[PDB]
């Protein structure tokens, strides 16, 4: 298992990072400096996880202390929805990169294909309570993301939430300058995307697995719910080979070709989750955690089902 995939950029990306949604902002920064001293180099980011400002505190620490070089760091971000106007993303982009501590990101992704009015609300809503559109496509919004890499704010460019059509529409984008470099989905033994991690990668385009160990601090979590870390099935496989059930959590996408971002803010859990490059899970250990899908959504975007871009009626 090699640490890094090859982007269609030339970039090398690390198959590993940590997940920073919900980190909260008082732990995140500790969260980072530690994941950077175990040996991540690859931490996921957004502006609408309100956390960025502190994220960056630890990236410029160890930039400082020498721990790691800029060059040998691979940060991401994501443009939210509210800004997908093209007189506001390079502003957006500036104040990620602001808030980093960082000239330059090595990776910016439209972090969902539904535009939103902008303003100060991260989801605008009417009287009735729907989300407000806007009347900005995913192809202009791309055109802007492309500006990005010849401004030179961002090395690559990409996409999350996308469904393969709207994968698509980008792809067959007339003038189309720079193809998307990730797609950031949604991925575990419970939502596996065989169709669309193949499309994707058939094109490409490199496949990142959010919520790996399946979001058990998700804010909308019921008790009754699926839970990957507790399932006696998945358990199994990872005291079969000495290692935990996030270990296997982890190294399931790794073994797809994915980049994987499991987030933790527990010191021991992000050494731990890192500790997956001494193992190999077999064909059938790999096709019996897939047999497990049950198309099952951490992340529906529950209150936009309307939106004319809504990624998750289309099959995938
Ligand atoms: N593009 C998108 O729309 C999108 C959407 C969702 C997620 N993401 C990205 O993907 C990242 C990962 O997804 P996620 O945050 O939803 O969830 P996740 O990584 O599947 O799960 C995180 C949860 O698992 C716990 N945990 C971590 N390591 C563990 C271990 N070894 N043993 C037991 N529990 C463990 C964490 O607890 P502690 O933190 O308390 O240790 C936390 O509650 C996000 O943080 C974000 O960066 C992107």
Redesign the pocket.
């Given at each position: 298992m090699a640490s890094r995939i090859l982007l269609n950029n030339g970039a090398k990306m690390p198959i590993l990072g940590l997940?920073?949604?919900?980190?909260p902002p008082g732990q995140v920064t500790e969260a980072v400096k530690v994941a950077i001293d175990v040996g991540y180099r690859h931490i996921?980011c957004?502006h609408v996880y309100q956390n960025e400002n502190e994220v960056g505190v630890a990236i410029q620490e160890k930039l400082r202390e020498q721990v790691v070089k800029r060059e040998e760091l691979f940060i991401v971000s994501?443009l939210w929805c509210t800004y997908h106007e093209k007189g506001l993303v390079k502003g957006a982009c500036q104040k990620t990169l602001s808030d980093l501590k960082l000239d330059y990101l090595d990776l910016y992704?439209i972090?969902?294909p539904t535009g939103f009015k902008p303003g100060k609300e991260f989801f605008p809503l009417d009287e009735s309570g729907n989300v407000v559109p806007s009347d900005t496509n995913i192809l202009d919004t791309w055109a802007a993301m492309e500006e990005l890499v010849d401004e030179g704010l961002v090395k690559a460019i990409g996409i999350?939430?996308f469904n393969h059509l709207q994968v698509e529409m980008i792809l067959n984008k007339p003038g189309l300058k720079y193809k998307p470099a990730v797609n950031?989905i949604?991925c575990?033994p419970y939502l596996t995307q065989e169709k669309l991690i193949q499309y994707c990668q058939s094109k490409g385009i490199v496949v990142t697995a959010?919520?790996?160990?399946?979001?058990?601090?998700?804010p909308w979590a019921k008790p009754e719910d699926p839970s990957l870390?507790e399932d006696p099935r998945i358990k199994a496989i990872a005291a079969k080979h000495n290692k935990?059930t996030?270990q296997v959590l982890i190294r399931f996408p790794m073994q797809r070709n994915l980049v994987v971002?499991?987030?933790?803010?527990?010191p021991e859990?992000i050494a731990?989750?890192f500790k997956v490059f001494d193992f190999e899970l077999s064909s059938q250990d790999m096709t019996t955690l897939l047999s497990y899908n049950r198309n099952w959504r951490?992340?529906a975007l529950a209150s936009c089902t309307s939106h004319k871009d809504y990624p998750f009626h289309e099959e995938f």
């Open positions: 997940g920073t949604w919900k980190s996921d957004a994501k992704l972090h969902w999350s939430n950031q949604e575990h959010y919520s790996p160990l399946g979001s058990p601090d998700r870390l935990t996030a971002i499991p987030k933790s803010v527990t859990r731990e989750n951490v992340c």
